[PDB]
């Protein structure tokens, strides 16, 4: 049988080594006959609670335990609020090929018709399945494989509230039956240049939201509070409203990256659009959105705060 | 022949008198829509929509309610910057005090460019502008051969044609090659039945929106109270959820008789009330089923007669 | 408390006297629907949906409208097999004779499976059948915490939970924990409004569905005329194309008095009128905004009082 | 400069000696792609894509063979009709031996109209065609600033201009005003990998399509045998569901040897195996993630080297 890591993060979705993972077993009792399963509790909290140390935390215990032989691949139960974001910092500082699988439920366990229950089971099947391997880090709810880079959460309630709006998902899993139609091109997990082995605190970035009449005094607090990059949630292809820019053009000047994304949510914030990218010192994110964008940009300014090598970053990852 | 006003607030969205150079020259560009209506043209301002201000929304509403008000008025039609049309498009939803059509319309490409979509798009707004069906439809944006209730309309996308969407309740209709068909209306009041009225308010109450994300801070509501916010959208996490050191801000904003309305990042579905969040303890508004752009212009308008939570909650839980 | 009446059409879609075993059953594996409604349940069929007849059409619309004629009737529930539910819902949308909601609920996954999604969807469907707001909405398909139009849902998807979509206009309304939210209303004629009258009819018109593709054949065409088809539903390339071929047996169907109806296979938009099909000297009705299974049930109503081309155009540009 | 061969097999797709005066005229109506390649053009045939048929199919795959295998070629085009163009690129996708760029392009309106998607469309292809990125991501579909993979590609609406999409996995990549990015590709093998091979092939096997609904028939089925099906593919209820009647028919299909690939009506989701139908028992293959139109291309390929239920079930769980 393989051997599979539960790592939890909060409550359950639907002895190891965690109760939260023992009751796991309890509620999903077809997933013991699939896998040998070990439980950790790495955080206890919702993911709208989620923090740069727990980030570090679970990514560094990842790389850990998918170093160990007898260890195929892990799973983590994870908020829907912010999956997204440990997902995709997990795809660029997991120094592995093994599957890391992230799963959660839009209803809680308790719920009639509650979703954790499948979601986990297939969660297992995809961690378990030879052709998860290299896939990078994956997200699995509602019968869908999404790649870290591309999956966000779409809708506030929905069961089927995961999306890949720029790609679509990479595979399906129904009643544990496992089929990928498609893997990411950009580079992810161990083709990674990123390394948090000694990060012990991300830089901080803030992320600003556009529209009409807009401000520079929420450009101005970031710089005071230390932001050593700025996510610009710009309208339509990345545009700021002017007031904006000219604070924007201030802080690049005096050594906060500036990256241009778009409030939208689907679509690049393209390079060489309206904005004078080189001339204002701004790096365009393009086919990402804000919160993945922050988290690229937070591994970057770990080794570099140039303008031409984090656009290359973008242009890559 | 019906008689359309053509409100250009930038550019030519089609090419390259009326009353003003910029409708000459789409009349130009798309000569059929003379064959449709008696067009005249003004210029109310001369921006891209990124550049969009509280000023042009309040002059370009005072406008079409002066046109509309005119017995010779069948109709206006706005060419707009598409980047901020929705927000322009929700304001006047609920400024307009008339039942004929309010049309918006611009382009994701411009007239230069090859496969140009601001001729169709155009001839389209004609056609669903002088349309019987389109009387108390609301404010609409007609783009790519499609009809969007001005409540339910985003720009989704950063560059497609097809970048429009309502992706909570779908198009109300279509308009392919000007043959004009409804299938849906807003059950929601708008225009007429608007309880709104900005015939006397020269400066909107300034609206911040906050982007949410994990180990998230208390400096940008902090920013926003001392540059007199007196509203704040929250831009939640899944369902309009807040980082802690953040609600703890906002509760702080709340009590100062700011106003906190939670709308999400995520992009569709209603931030709800009585899910994670205690709104009635905390001192919140739910927008529920909106967008933090859309919900920035609500509260600026229910901010124009009431700062209390209860009335502000009953304007996101009827508009 | 109001009194809504399940009517099955099969077995159980939650769990694994009100008048019907099935519907007993129901109420045991979904106690919190008792404190809602008074229920009453009949068995109208005990079938997959995949066997769904005209015969069982007739016998559920006759006795929904007899239910729904009754003052002591608020609503009436059917729980139907997923597959064919959109054409039984279409159905009813056009025979039922009352603006008191009738609804549709199903399941995607069986009731023993794990994370079934008949539990919630049947308490989401009973709320919607006793809120007011549904009056006059027409018959609605409740699933996945969406209320979806007759006239434009269908299934989308072979087996995924959200597989119930409406592509040309999105859902009329939520349903999020019972709570029930309209933010459209259809503008087709419906129910009430409808001309049809189904009362006296106890077999329905025969109409044939075709598949269009590349090296297309006409011995389809000609096995439906064998067969005594009354109307044919072709499902066309993109906008409603016929291979040569299949267009010239299409012609000979029409000319001997049998109504060729032009559909598409694609999934979404409008099968138009003035396009590449001549319709008028062909003798062709295009069927425009629906799809080949429910343009089948309108051509087969509109079969009950006429097979003249222009009578059905209209009935199509109509409903 | 790279050398690419546009091959038309219809009208030109842009404006109102390469070697094809409808390749001429597409150079001068884009003048735009003279400056990115050395475009040669050839007419394979001067067709609506609605006429097309298996005898074009082979003689265009087995010419885009010839001009691969040269070594002056790096890319071929091919303009066509929107309505049957998912069918020639999959076709293609299974029998272009080379892991040089094929890209599909057409047109959703004509080049004579406002707006016209045509020159964006094919200065948006010669730009994938000659991408370093665009070699071994298989046959593709360029429209709408979208790159479909072939085997995922479908005409979705009957009009608009974001027809094409990949409902089951979404767009490969992106080409705006020629930038081309990749972000996933097909792990399904596709051209050199594929086991097809069509060079000594003439006519293709007779595969029909079915469209399942209530109240089916076994006379299509029937009159399919009777015309000398090879293969059928039954369009089915939901997750590939026929009605009785017709899975007798079917039944007696496959007893006689003509292969059964059940396929569903719905537009997106595999037709799984092991749901409610007993493939392996009624002797049908399950085409698993596909569409009818596309099952029909695998199915007619699979059928020029057997009628085995087992190792055609093996091909459809492949590609
Ligand atoms: N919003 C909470 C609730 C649980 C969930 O939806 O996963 C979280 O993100 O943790
Ligand atoms: N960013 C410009 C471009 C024009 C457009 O796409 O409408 C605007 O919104 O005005
Ligand atoms: N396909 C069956 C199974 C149940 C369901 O999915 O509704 C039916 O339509 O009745
Ligand atoms: N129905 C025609 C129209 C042209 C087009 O839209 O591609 C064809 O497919 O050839």
């Given at each position: 049988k393989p051997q599979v890591t539960?790592?939890?993060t909060g409550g359950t979705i639907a002895s190891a080594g965690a109760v939260t993972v023992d009751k796991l077993l309890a509620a999903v009792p077809a997933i013991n006959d699939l896998a040998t399963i070990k439980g950790e509790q790495?955080?206890?909290i919702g993911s709208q609670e989620m923090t740069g140390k727990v980030w570090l935390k679970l990514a560094k215990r990842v790389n850990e335990l998918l170093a160990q032989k007898?260890?195929?691949?892990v799973i983590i139960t994870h908020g829907t609020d912010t999956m997204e974001?440990?997902?995709?910092?997990l795809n660029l500082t997991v120094k592995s090929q093994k599957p890391v699988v992230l799963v959660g439920a839009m209803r809680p366990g308790s719920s009639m018709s509650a979703d954790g229950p499948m979601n986990l089971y297939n969660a297992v099947n995809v961690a378990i399945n030879k052709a998860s391997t290299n896939k990078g880090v994956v997200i699995v709810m509602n019968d869908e494989i999404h790649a870290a880079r591309e999956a966000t959460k779409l809708n506030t309630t929905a069961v089927n509230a995961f999306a890949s709006p720029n790609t679509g998902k990479i595979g399906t899993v129904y009643y544990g039956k496992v089929?990928?139609?498609?893997?990411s091109v950009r580079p992810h997990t161990l083709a990674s240049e990123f390394d948090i082995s000694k990060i012990e605190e991300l830089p901080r970035v803030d992320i600003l939201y556009a529209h009409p009449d807009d401000t520079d005094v929420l450009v101005n607090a970031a710089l005071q509070a230390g932001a050593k990059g700025i996510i610009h949630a710009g309208m339509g292809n990345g545009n700021p409203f002017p007031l904006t820019q000219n604070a924007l053009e201030k802080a690049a000047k005096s050594g906060?990256?500036?990256?241009?994304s778009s409030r939208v949510g689907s679509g690049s914030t393209t390079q060489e659009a309206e904005v004078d990218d080189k001339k204002l010192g701004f790096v365009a994110t393009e086919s990402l959105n804000p919160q993945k964008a922050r988290v690229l940009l937070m591994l970057a300014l770990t080794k570099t705060s140039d303008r031409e090598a984090i656009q290359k970053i973008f242009s890559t990852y």
């Open positions: 539960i790592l939890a790495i955080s206890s007898e260890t195929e691949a974001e440990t997902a995709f910092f089929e990928y139609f498609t893997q906060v990256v500036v990256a241009r």
